[PDB]
Amino acid sequence: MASKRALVILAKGAEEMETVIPVDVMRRAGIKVTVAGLAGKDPVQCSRDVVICPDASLEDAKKEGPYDVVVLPGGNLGAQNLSESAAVKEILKEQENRKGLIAAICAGPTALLAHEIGFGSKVTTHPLAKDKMMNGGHYTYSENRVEKDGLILTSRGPGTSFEFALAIVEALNGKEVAAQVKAPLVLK
C-alpha cells in the first residue's frame, strides 16, 4: 500500500559513506527516507569532513513517525553521540516496542548497547568495535558481513554498506525489489 519510511539519524562524526550509501540505496528502492540531524537542522560535519545538510532535525522528525526502519550509521564519534542521546534512546525503544526494524552499521550497533536494545540477538560490528559491543555479554557476536536476527540488522564497515542497505531493502520491500535495485549498481 503506502511507501515504506526510513529514519536515518545523522550525528557529528558519522561515517559519511555509511550515511550516504544507505540513504541513496533506500531511495532507489522507493523508500521515503528522512535524514534527521541529531543536533538540529544545521549541516553535519562527518568523520572525513564531508558536510551533509539533513532533511530535518531529529526533534521534528521524531514527531512524524512511525518509521518502518530506524538506521544508525557508524563512525566512532557519531556512534558515541548516538549513544549519549536520550532522544535516540526513546526512538529506539519505541521502534523495538512496535516490532519495527532497527539497522546499525560499523560502530553504530554500540548505540544499541548503550540504549539496552535487542539484547540476546546475534550482531556484527566493525572488528574494532567488537569489544565495546560485547561488554557484558548481552549479544552473541557474528563475523557475517551483514547479520539479521529478527528485527536487529547489523553490518561491519564502509565496505559492507551496500550489502547492509540492500538487506534493509529486502526486509522492507522484498527480495525482488532488492535484486532490481542491486543490478544497476555494478556491485561485484
Next chain:
Amino acid sequence: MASKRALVILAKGAEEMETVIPVDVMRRAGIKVTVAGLAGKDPVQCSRDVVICPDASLEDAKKEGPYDVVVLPGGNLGAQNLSESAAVKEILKEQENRKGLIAAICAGPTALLAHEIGFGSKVTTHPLAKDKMMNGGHYTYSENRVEKDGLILTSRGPGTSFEFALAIVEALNGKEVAAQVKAPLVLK
C-alpha cells in the same frame, strides 16, 4: 614531500555515493581533498537528494591549483552539468597538459568526451553510458571495473567506487598506502 592534492568537482545531480566514497577514501590516504561546487559555494542537491556542502566554489578552487588528481563523479545529470562547463573544460585541459591524473566514474567519463580529453585511451563507464562515451570512436571501451590507461583512470558505478578510489590512492601514494587504507574498510 608535500601531501598530494585532489580536486573533486561537485555538480547538481551528481551521484552522492560516487562523490563521498572517493572523498572519504582519499582523505583516509592523507590526500588533501577539495570538494568544489561547480555552481558556487552553496549546498549541492545530489541525484538521490543528499545535500552536500562544498568546501569551496570551483571558481575559487580552480585558482588554487595545481592538483595531483581531478576527480569527476558520475550521476547522469551531474555529468551533463560537468560536460557543459567551460570552467571544467579549462581545468581538464590544463591537467592533461601538465600530465596530471584525471579520474572519472560511471557517467563521469562522458565529460572527458565533451571536453575532448584523453582520446585514444582505453576507458570504462557505466554500461548505460557506453554509447554516449563511444560516440565517434574516440576511446576504446573496457569492461574492467576500474580501467587506467596512463593518466586517464575510469570506473563503472556506485559499486565500483571503493575500487576506483583505492586506484586513485595507489596512483598517487603507492600500493602499500592503498593496501593500508583498504584493510579497515571491510571490503569483500
